[PDB]
Amino acid sequence: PIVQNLQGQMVHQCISPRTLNAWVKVVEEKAFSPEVIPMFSALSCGATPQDLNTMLNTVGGHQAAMQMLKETINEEAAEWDRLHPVQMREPRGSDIAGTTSTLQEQIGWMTHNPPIPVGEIYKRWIILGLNKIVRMYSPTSILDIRQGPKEPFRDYVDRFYKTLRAEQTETLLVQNANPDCKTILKALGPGATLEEMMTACQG
Amino acid sequence: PIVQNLQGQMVHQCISPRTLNAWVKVVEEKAFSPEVIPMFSALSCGATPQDLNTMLNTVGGHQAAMQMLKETINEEAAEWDRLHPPRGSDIAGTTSTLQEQIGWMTHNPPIPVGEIYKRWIILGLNKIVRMYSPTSILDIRQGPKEPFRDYVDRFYKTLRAEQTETLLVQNANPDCKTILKALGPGATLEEMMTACQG
């Protein structure tokens, strides 16, 4: 990535073994759960397009997702070329993706004044592609999440908003609760906070 | 490797324990799956030929693969000697000293012997990934109760190690194949996978 130093200058550093391993392990363990994306964004902080490609290439398996990711990049790159047709040369869609640009040109654009953050633009495409994959790989629908017979309300609410996060509230949360809690929640009335709802269905 | 510092100068650093260990462990765990190559490239960022040799030497076992890698280096080193009457052996780091390697790399204009030697190594590693690839793309076919997502993962994983329009849909199971052909050509993988979900 490109970062500051002691002198206060934007310089290129090699991607660390910590950052490489962190990204490999989070995919191995969390696959494509919603929380993988913010981890990717954080681990790719200040990343060049080269670094973004390195991170994606280090992923073993999940090649259905990577292919869906490649297709998303093509659509956003095609849209970039449309909006930006034809000092250093102005970047094309393939330059932002790191296929037709060198590391020196990438550093050039990112540290230019004014800068053209090709790393951040390319990351925006990748994160947009990852969101679609998270959408796809979501196992359950929000309609199918319903409180069990002896399941606590806390555990039910966890499953609800876990499923809601992956898919993307007022009526559906209360309506799919079990009879004992449902009666208490409706008795509390509308406009009640989640804290008040969870406190009510504790015992 | 050779990297920048506070003063903004290219200087030699000792290869770190973290880097050394990271490379040893990825080889121990992943052997020679496709993703081992980009991890090698990254861990060898700014590496000298000496550093590249160190990383290869730290690999215990897989000596069949490492011998094939040597034979590839010899071929590319011989080819370098033909085209250039730094010799091939100097790039490989057998006949050159660290001082000379740093000399070429930090020269103006620079001769990046580290990056050239890495190119030979990555070329040799790709051959090993080819060899060690178990299945052919023609043998990848969707199972009876196998989800389409899982089938697509196996397809492109095999395709990656070997190296689409016709073979992916043709080898899918009857239920999905009917839906995929009904969707028509020029359909995105997102649309194809969404169609064969339920």
Partner: peptide
């Protein structure tokens, strides 16, 4: 397109 199916990320074409 920028990336053909099967080729790695950041793969230079041609």
């Amino acid at each position: 397109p920028v990336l053909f199916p099967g080729q790695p990320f950041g793969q230079p074409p041609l």
